[PDB]
DNA sequence: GCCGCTACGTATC
């Protein structure tokens, strides 16, 4: 889009070269672990180049996975409540903060991944 | 069509 | 100052021949000339006591040289908790006489007298359900005994307290109900708002698709809402130096509800 | 003795400008202009009473000759299970006249006379649910007979207290919330409270990531939160005798939450 | 900016 | 009239 900027799962990105290709189409490429960061190729003689590490703006010192992104846009839909990168953050943090067995079974998932680093 | 202002409504009134 | 001259315009409160203005005086004139108890309900916005002030305010009082006034139509409003004494204080007052401090049997007499003075042909109770339930047998002997016909205005609460009294509930029993505009009927009632109401020095189209969708989703078909939300819209608008109401700042006004 | 000196100004109290009570201000403003009856709503910890204790402290009474005081904003708090006649009480109070022994129907006709040529303007009444049931027929009463703006403040709670009623819950709709700060707002914040109310002999540079970190998890977004921590660790700080908050210092200080 | 302490504003106040 | 985000239908482990 006009502006340097990429829609993505609710999420806004800004990228360093992006205002550049405002109108263009770019592949996007991403880790479901954590979408705060997106790559951004782009086609050029019928092959992908690489372009920039496009961020989401304002939370360049926050990780959000693609499961926590989604749940908070299910949830932040059916609240009525307007679309950003923070009011998605929003509706993330207090689910984090305050259990389900999905949450309870993804923190001992995450303990074993912790070990792993 | 008319239409009334209260406060005259109250200004005509006994 | 032009613009402080319509801020202090808007502000303000008019009344508009509306359908279910209309539709409330021809059934009015029906109980008052049958002399017969009925009661007026519907949900809190719907502008049941705009409606029962247009009845008030016309049938005027009738002045011959000094008696005391004949008054066609009584609308009391009790304070809360009220007790037998406060209505009848109420009544003597709005017919203008000065209450004096005595027993309740003093201010019965007194109101009794006073009504059959005036020539009063209905008396209207706005917000029924502040009456304290054993009032309304002083409502139903001044229903009986002299030919008034008594209104009650409330809402939905206002049965759910009728429905304590078998006495009170098989009296009055006859009503009409107060409805949200839909369809049609709303999107009529915007323009007259725009053209009778607002006065805006250009058209702000508000009867549009794109404005319409606005509008439905604030307002809820209740009247009460259109007048609040289209006077902020003006007064905000106005202060902004705009000739019209547009979608960006009526959507301002509305994401406040 | 220098020490002393400071100590006493950090267990004191300030208003700090913030977005959330400049924008408060700007639209209890458009409120009262519009003599439009609203609430305000957030989590306890939000400061919303500080944004209105601003707002009183503009608006001062314009005191002259022997007239009373012109009074725009009023702000009222009431005691728990506040009835109606402790809501006259204080309101009579708060416009300075004497209360004297009378009943229910005499605190409510003073009550209006004072609201009278006594240029009120907006009343703002503090965590709102204290009300018993019955007062807010009293509150819509005034708000609609006068041309008062009546603001009820509170939290969430307040809304459940509120839709037991529709006749209430249709005179106050607009609504602003108060939210919890995050991102760059909080960052931004921290500065303020380094730079304007602790004031220390050295920076502490709280901006720091690692700084941030351990505020974050302390105060969750919460301005009541933010205001405590860091007098309770400057107090700390001081009285040790540190030129500046540390990591160690300020985790000691959070680990008591 | 200025900021003000709570309880002088309150001393000020008529 | 054109375009990123939601929602429903179908298939398989
Ligand atoms: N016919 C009308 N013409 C113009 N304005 C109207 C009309 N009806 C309602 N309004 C406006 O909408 C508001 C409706 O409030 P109103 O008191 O009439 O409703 P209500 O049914 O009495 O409320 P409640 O039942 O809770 O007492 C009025 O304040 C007025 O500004
Ligand atoms: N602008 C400000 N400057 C300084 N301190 C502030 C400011 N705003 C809020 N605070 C602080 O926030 C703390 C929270 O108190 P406050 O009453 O403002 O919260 P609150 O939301 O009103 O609480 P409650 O909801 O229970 O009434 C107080 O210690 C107050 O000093
Ligand atoms: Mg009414």
Redesign the interface.
Known sequence: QRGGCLQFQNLMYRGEYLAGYAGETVNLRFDPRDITTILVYRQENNQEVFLTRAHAQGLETEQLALDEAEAASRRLRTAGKTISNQSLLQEVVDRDALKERQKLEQTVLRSAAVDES | ???????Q??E??? | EWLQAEIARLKGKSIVPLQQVKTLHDWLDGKRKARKSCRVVGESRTGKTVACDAYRYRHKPQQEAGRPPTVPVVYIRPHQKCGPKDLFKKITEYLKYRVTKGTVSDFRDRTIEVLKGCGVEMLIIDEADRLKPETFADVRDIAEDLGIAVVLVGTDRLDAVIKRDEQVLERFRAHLRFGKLSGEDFKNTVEMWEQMVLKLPVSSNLKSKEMLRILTSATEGYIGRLDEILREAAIRSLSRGLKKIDKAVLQEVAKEY
């Open positions: 069509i008319e239409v009334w202002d209260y406060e409504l109250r005509e009134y006994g």
